[PDB]
Design a protein around this ligand. Sequence first.
Ligand SMILES: *[C@@H]1O[C@H](CO)[C@@H](O[C@H]2O[C@H](CO)[C@@H](O)[C@H](O)[C@H]2NC(C)=O)[C@H](O)[C@H]1NC(C)=O
Ligand SMILES: *[C@@H]1O[C@H](CO)[C@@H](O)[C@H](O)[C@H]1NC(C)=O
Lengths: 52, 395, 338
Amino acid sequence: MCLLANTTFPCSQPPCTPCCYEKEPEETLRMLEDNVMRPGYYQLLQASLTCS
Amino acid sequence: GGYEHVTVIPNTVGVPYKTLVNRPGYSPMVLEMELLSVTLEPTLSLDYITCEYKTVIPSPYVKCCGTAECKDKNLPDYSCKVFTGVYPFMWGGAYCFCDAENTQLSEAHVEKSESCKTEFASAYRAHTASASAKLRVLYQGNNITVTAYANGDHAVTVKDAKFIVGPMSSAWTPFDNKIVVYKGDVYNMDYPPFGAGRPGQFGDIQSRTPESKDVYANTQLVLQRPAAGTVHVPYSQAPSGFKYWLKERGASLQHTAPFGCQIATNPVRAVNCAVGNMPISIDIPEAAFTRVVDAPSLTDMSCEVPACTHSSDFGGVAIIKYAASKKGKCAVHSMTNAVTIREAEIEVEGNSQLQISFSTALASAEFRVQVCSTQVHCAAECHPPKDHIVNYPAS
Amino acid sequence: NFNVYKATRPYLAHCPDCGEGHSCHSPVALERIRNEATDGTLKIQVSLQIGIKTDDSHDWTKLRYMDNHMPADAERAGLFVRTSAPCTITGTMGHFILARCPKGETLTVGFTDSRKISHSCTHPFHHDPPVIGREKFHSRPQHGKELPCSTYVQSTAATTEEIEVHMPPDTPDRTLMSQQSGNVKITVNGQTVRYKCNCGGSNEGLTTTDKVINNCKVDQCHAAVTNHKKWQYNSPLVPRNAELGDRKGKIHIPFPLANVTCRVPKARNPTVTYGKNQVIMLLYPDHPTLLSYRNMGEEPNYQEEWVMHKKEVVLTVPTEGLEVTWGNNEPYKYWPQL
Ligand SMILES: *[C@@H]1O[C@H](CO)[C@@H](O[C@H]2O[C@H](CO)[C@@H](O)[C@H](O)[C@H]2NC(C)=O)[C@H](O)[C@H]1NC(C)=O
Ligand SMILES: *[C@@H]1O[C@H](CO)[C@@H](O)[C@H](O)[C@H]1NC(C)=O
């Protein structure tokens, strides 16, 4: 589980998907910064910076 | 249900030794024994590991038109300093609006480098050593391998013969109480205790495991005032203690150890240390022995030496003519300690002759050869060899 | 698809020597030089990004550097690494470079931009990698003795090793300010600009629109653009963001350190002659070769010497035995005849 202000969500499945960074780059980085101490950070980083 | 043969051989690897088994009322038996390897593995207790340190320096906090404040952080070698009257310059001019009222907060701490899992030295406490031996035995015309602890309380049975190796005459070890291990090299070093390392020396950074999480650090990290109009974090620190030990370490124990010790790691052990002797006990079963009456009888024996050279190897040749009562196997053994015979057993026929290879150091070799239960005198005039120094050891 | 370079960007950072010993805001600034690899390989961290274009796409023939406020494309062929002489580049990806360098006292990393202006960064770095084995050789052999050594793997894969990243600080720019008859005019140009003036009325704020400061001089004002959209390496050569606390991010890095095997050659066996309790060796080394010896008794008396040229060595062989090691060859054992 990862954190977003007051919601709690699975790290591999952020609500911004697809194109998290392309849609809103500022809020995507802020969300990633709030989850650095979390063990599932790299699962969140992978999903947020992935788009085709 | 058998006969126990007890003998003592020197603790020297690659030298075949001949032993005469004489069970009363039974034909003599010759056994060839050779030490393949002798391992001394000490019990290790890991105190800590050491490696290259990493000075973690984040972006400096430049407070424009204000005063920054240092917070006491529980980090190894944590250093914080607020510098007053700073005027830093960036690409498009001055970073701060104010001329003099600006401060720079410089912060730094020491942690393990990414290399610590790959490049590291381990500090161990070496105590009592467990001795083990690999022995080759020429038993019933076949070579058998026996691997046992040289403590005298470890029975290993191969082809129904019970083997008891040791205890070792010498309790000597090339390792001291404190040892340092780096890859394939072991060093006898009185390393600093844990929590007491010095800067720029072995143990400047000490952690318990390459992946432990807490670490001890004494690197003499001191933060300096930044250069005029420059954004950077200058500092003075003693260079890596690991990186310097790795340079000034000298020759490992593989090169410095007495008695020709070979040093191996994973686990750390002393291999083929030529020190003292090794007692060997062999419980040979009753079925292996044959009675003197049941064995062939030897009469009218004569010995001639057509060629001899006194050297470490079998430089002597002897032809023994015989008259046997029946066909069977006969054991060959030298009754003189100054001469050693290569062959342990020969096939006897009747009114035939046998050829043996022998080793001696004497120029005038007077020796007795026992073929089965009868002795024959051999007269040998051995000559010196071409080489003064040999590349292989002998008895 | 996964591209970490969409969030990150190349940057300008302090360099003590940009050429002729003069300091500058370098687009090829040196961050950290790692020399943990026993094989001599150097892992160099730079301010620019190699193998990535401005549009974030991966292209090995391209290089991305910060060109006065906006990133620009440059050629990979123009990238160079040198100490006392040029280095052999083994791998390049993002902020990292893998290089095999000769003996030196400085480390220079440079490149050629669009308008052919060569940018370089020189840092004082003592490079003299330690010898692997017992022989100081020049070229690596195909076959030889297998000895343990470490290197930085050529693999692109993002695992194990990592770096800290964060939002860049406010970039000062005096071109944003102009004089409107004799006052201060701040032109935003579709950016978020933070301004401060040494005049009354209005002198604070983060503005998304153009602002005017009446009865004020251009020298009395300070303007900076705010870049809250991208990520940058947590560099000690770049200031921290003032309007953000200890907010940080992390990204996996290429070329991590791992244990491998290094092939070492064995020096040719010397012509051996024997004597009464002594051994004579006629040594012919092609390169510096370590010669070591010890007695196989109670007193080993270890002695060592580096043989550079043609030399005859007379060694005493005791009754206990003598062990001689000539370079990377297996030790020779000698015993006197009874
Ligand atoms: C038992 O083992 C020894 C040692 O391996 C063997 O001895 C010889 O082996 C070869 C001849 O077969 C020669 O090339 C070696 O020089 C010699 N070595 C020694 C130390 O004497 C022997 O043949 C073996 N006997 C068996 C397997 O029956
Ligand atoms: C490297 O170090 C040792 C071999 O010297 C080994 O125990 C370890 O697993 C290796 N680890 C890596 C990450 O290469």
